[PDB]
Structure formats: structure tokens, C-alpha cells
Design a protein around this ligand. Structure first.
Ligand SMILES: [Cu+]
Ligand SMILES: [Cu+]
Ligand SMILES: [Zn+2]
Ligand SMILES: [Zn+2]
Lengths: 153, 153
């Protein structure tokens, strides 16, 4: 199997460790971990194009989009590769993340290795907001914490 | 061209930004930037295998060594792929980094993308120390700051 990890950090209290596991290179990627310090409810959760934290999460660029599609939810065919949807924080501000995605990969020329995982201020509307921003960013708001996705064992 | 970047941070004052650029996939990588907060003198500078920052630099594992060789300096045939030698801090604690290397790559199956760049407390003896530790780590001592190597624009 192949594995990766991202340590999420930002200017505020939001932080966590997200693990990626891919049993087979043709297979789904399991994404799991704990993010704390979040407001209760939904938060946009995306892989952004660049593993560049020189200006914090801002320098990460847009959602990772090698197929040049519009923004969607992870279940949509029309989505960015980076569109992992939302994660949900409980009443104590903890998101016990558990996602399985068949579009992202840890290998190949479209790998998310070396790119940036971002958790956002607000819910990702999954492209259903009826404006141009919805089909670009999902209206998820600011970037609360980010981490470069690294090779793990 | 292919570009990457690592933002070095740690538990102490040591921090910096190191850029990577590779014009051709079978050509050299230019490595440049700045590191501050260092003691004056030589500091070991390596790519470690894993981009796992969950325990800071400690979780990055050993020097990246896909070809199973002994530790050396960058200009030695016998070296780890990750062996980038020493950077030099001036009297103000600032190391201005300007390296060209033809062993590391930003692409291919042994790419350093998603792995960890680490700056160390002591000089790297470049494998010439004449003890077991020399041919493993170069006696570079503790890891002062580290960053996962990410894809840059
Ligand atoms: Cu995002
Ligand atoms: Cu090292
Ligand atoms: Zn998107
Ligand atoms: Zn080495």
C-alpha cells in the first residue's frame, strides 16, 4: 500500500493530522484523522494545487484541477480532483475525518503528493450556490489551516 | 521547468524558505533561498525520506536513500540521494543557500517532492568522519528545522 500525511496548521487554533492510505494505485484513497479548533458544523475540505506555504495557505493556489473542470462535490463527475467536499466538526470543535475518494490518488502524474490540504472557514456548497464562485470554490470562505501532503510510511 | 519549495520551521528560531527549480527532467536542480536563526558555521542539509511532519523533523525518517548507498557529500559518487551537504550561516546566523545538484530530481519515481528538507545543528562531515555514524548521518546532530517539499507555481 501507499500512504501520505498532512499536518494542518494556520494562524488561528485550527490544527490536525490527516492520513491518506491507498491500498492499490488504481484504488480509492482513504482519508482520516482529527482536526480540532473548528467551529461546529461543515467546513470545506480540498486539495489545492501548490505545496507552497510561503504566504501561508494563500500561496497554495486554487483547487487542484488537472482535468480543467468546474467545482463540484466529491460525488459529482463534474468536479475538481481536489474536491473532497466537507468535513464536520462536533460540538467540541473536533472533526473526526473519515472520507473515501476514488478520484484523488497518491501516485501518478495527477498525485496529490506535494500539494496542499486546506480546511476552510465555511461549508462547501458543492457547486449548488447559483453563482460563479460556487462553481470555482464552493463558497467555502477563508483558509483556516493547511498542510503540504507528504509521503508517509 | 518544474518548481518546488520548502518552508523550514521547527521548535526554535531556525526558519527559512528554500526553492527548487529543474529546467529539464534529466537536468540538474537549482536549490536556493535563505535560512535564519542558525549558529555561525556549517549545518548539515538533507532531504529525508518521509514528508511526515507529525513529530516535526523527527518523523521524516532517515536521509532519502532509494539506491541503498552510504552517506556522503553531494559531490561524492557514494551518497544518499538526499545528501545536499552543508549550508553556511554567517555571523548574523543567516545562511544564503545556492546549490546545484544533479542527483536529486523533482520528477520520476525517486522525486524528492513530498519528502522533507531538514537543516541540522552541526556540520555534516560528508561521510569522512571515520565512524559508523558518519556513513549514516554525517554526524550532523539534531534536526533544527524542516519542511515538506511541495510543488510550486
Ligand atoms: Cu480549499
Ligand atoms: Cu538530515
Ligand atoms: Zn473545487
Ligand atoms: Zn546521507
Amino acid at each position: 500500500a501507499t500512504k501520505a500525511v498532512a499536518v494542518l496548521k494556520g494562524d488561528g487554533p485550527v490544527q490536525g493530522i490527516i492520513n491518506f492510505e491507498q491500498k492499490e494505485s488504481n484504488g480509492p484513497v482513504k482519508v482520516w484523522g482529527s482536526i480540532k479548533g473548528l467551529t461546529e458544523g461543515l467546513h470545506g475540505f480540498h486539495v489545492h494545487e501548490f505545496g507552497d506555504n510561503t504566504a501561508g495557505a494563500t500561496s497554495a493556489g486554487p483547487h487542484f484541477n488537472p482535468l480543467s473542470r468546474k467545482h463540484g462535490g466529491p460525488k459529482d463527475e463534474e468536479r475538481h480532483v481536489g474536491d473532497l467536499g466537507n468535513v464536520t466538526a462536533d460540538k467540541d470543535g473536533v472533526a473526526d475525518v473519515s472520507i473515501e475518494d476514488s478520484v484523488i490518488s497518491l501516485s501518478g502524474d495527477h498525485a496529490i503528493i506535494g500539494r496542499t490540504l486546506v480546511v476552510h472557514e465555511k461549508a462547501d456548497d458543492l457547486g449548488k450556490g447559483g453563482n460563479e464562485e460556487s462553481t470555482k470554490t464552493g463558497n467555502a470562505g477563508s483558509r483556516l489551516a493547511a498542510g503540504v501532503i507528504g509521503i508517509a510510511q
